[PDB]
Design an enzyme around this catalytic site. Structure first.
Site, mmCIF file in Angstrom:
data_model
loop_
_atom_site.group_PDB
_atom_site.id
_atom_site.type_symbol
_atom_site.label_atom_id
_atom_site.label_comp_id
_atom_site.label_asym_id
_atom_site.label_seq_id
_atom_site.Cartn_x
_atom_site.Cartn_y
_atom_site.Cartn_z
ATOM 1 N N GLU A 117 0.830 -1.216 0.000
ATOM 2 C CA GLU A 117 0.000 0.000 0.000
ATOM 3 C C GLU A 117 0.864 1.265 0.000
ATOM 4 O O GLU A 117 0.608 2.225 -0.757
ATOM 5 C CB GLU A 117 -0.935 -0.007 1.201
ATOM 6 C CG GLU A 117 -2.100 -1.038 1.051
ATOM 7 C CD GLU A 117 -3.207 -0.558 0.082
ATOM 8 O OE1 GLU A 117 -3.060 0.498 -0.513
ATOM 9 O OE2 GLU A 117 -4.191 -1.287 -0.105
ATOM 10 N N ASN A 145 -7.511 9.311 -5.226
ATOM 11 C CA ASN A 145 -8.315 8.371 -5.973
ATOM 12 C C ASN A 145 -9.167 9.085 -7.044
ATOM 13 O O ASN A 145 -9.468 10.266 -6.918
ATOM 14 C CB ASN A 145 -9.195 7.557 -4.993
ATOM 15 C CG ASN A 145 -8.370 6.920 -3.845
ATOM 16 O OD1 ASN A 145 -8.671 7.097 -2.659
ATOM 17 N ND2 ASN A 145 -7.318 6.236 -4.205
ATOM 18 N N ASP A 164 -12.296 9.148 -7.556
ATOM 19 C CA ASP A 164 -13.528 9.732 -7.013
ATOM 20 C C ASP A 164 -13.323 11.020 -6.191
ATOM 21 O O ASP A 164 -14.276 11.546 -5.610
ATOM 22 C CB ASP A 164 -14.332 8.681 -6.220
ATOM 23 C CG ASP A 164 -13.692 8.322 -4.860
ATOM 24 O OD1 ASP A 164 -12.543 8.720 -4.605
ATOM 25 O OD2 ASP A 164 -14.344 7.627 -4.037
ATOM 26 N N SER A 195 -11.521 11.197 -3.434
ATOM 27 C CA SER A 195 -11.049 10.828 -2.095
ATOM 28 C C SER A 195 -9.509 10.633 -2.158
ATOM 29 O O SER A 195 -8.913 10.647 -3.243
ATOM 30 C CB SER A 195 -11.727 9.528 -1.591
ATOM 31 O OG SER A 195 -11.213 8.434 -2.304
ATOM 32 N N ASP A 201 -6.141 8.428 -0.154
ATOM 33 C CA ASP A 201 -5.680 7.399 0.780
ATOM 34 C C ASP A 201 -4.468 7.950 1.575
ATOM 35 O O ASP A 201 -3.626 8.583 0.995
ATOM 36 C CB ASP A 201 -5.148 6.161 0.061
ATOM 37 C CG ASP A 201 -6.208 5.403 -0.703
ATOM 38 O OD1 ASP A 201 -7.423 5.434 -0.365
ATOM 39 O OD2 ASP A 201 -5.768 4.742 -1.649
ATOM 40 N N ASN A 257 -8.762 5.408 3.434
ATOM 41 C CA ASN A 257 -9.446 6.281 2.518
ATOM 42 C C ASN A 257 -10.402 7.287 3.196
ATOM 43 O O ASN A 257 -11.176 6.948 4.109
ATOM 44 C CB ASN A 257 -10.196 5.429 1.514
ATOM 45 C CG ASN A 257 -10.893 6.255 0.476
ATOM 46 O OD1 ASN A 257 -12.063 6.559 0.626
ATOM 47 N ND2 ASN A 257 -10.192 6.636 -0.551
HETATM 48 NI NI NI Z 1 -6.372 2.521 -1.996
#
Ligand code: NI
Ligand SMILES: [Cl-]
Ligand SMILES: [Cl-]
Ligand code: NA
Length: 129
Positions: free
Chosen positions: A35, A46, A48, A50, A52, A59
Site C-alpha cells: 500500500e 483516488n 472519485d 477521495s 488514501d 481512505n
Molecule cells: Ni487505496
C-alpha cells in the site's frame, strides 16, 4: 517515517494486529508494504476525489476527514493527517475498524491482489518478535 519490515512487524504486534479478526501478522505487513512501501507519509488521490493516507492507505471517503471529500464519512473520527504520523497508533486503530467492516482485509485492494493466498508468514521471517 519509512519503517523497516521487522520494525513495523514489532509495532503492529504491540498494537494488537497479530491475528486480529483472524489475520496473522504477515498479512498486515504485506498490506503495508504494497500500500505504502512502509512509509507513514504516503498519500494517493483516488479517481472519485477521495485520498488514501498513511502506512495502510486509509481512505477519506469513509474513514477520516480531510476537508475535501464532499459527502464523505469520518468513521474513525480523526483528521486524515493523524494517519501520517510516525506513531502508527491512529492507523492501527482505524485499520481495526476497517477490517471489522464486513469484507475483512479485502478492504485493501493491494492485500487482495498481492498478499491474499500467498505465503504471508514470509513477511515476518527473520524478525525477533
Ligand atoms: Ni487505496
Ligand atoms: Cl470532507
Ligand atoms: Cl474475514
Ligand atoms: Na471523509
Amino acid at each position: 517515517k519509512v519503517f523497516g519490515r521487522c520494525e513495523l512487524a514489532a509495532a503492529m504486534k504491540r498494537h494488537g494486529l497479530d491475528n486480529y479478526r483472524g489475520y496473522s501478522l504477515g498479512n498486515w505487513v504485506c498490506a503495508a508494504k504494497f500500500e505504502s512501501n512502509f512509509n507513514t507519509q504516503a498519500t494517493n488521490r483516488n479517481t472519485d476525489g477521495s485520498t488514501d493516507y498513511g502506512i495502510l492507505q486509509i481512505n477519506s471517503r469513509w474513514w477520516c476527514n480531510d476537508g475535501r471529500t464532499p459527502g464523505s464519512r469520518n468513521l474513525c473520527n480523526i483528521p486524515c493527517s493523524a494517519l501520517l504520523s510516525s506513531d502508527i497508533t491512529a492507523s492501527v486503530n482505524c485499520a481495526k475498524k476497517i477490517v471489522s467492516d464486513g469484507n475483512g482485509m479485502n478492504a485493501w485492494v493491494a492485500w487482495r491482489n498481492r498478499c491474499k493466498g500467498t505465503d504471508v508468514q514470509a513477511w515476518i521471517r527473520g524478525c525477533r518478535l
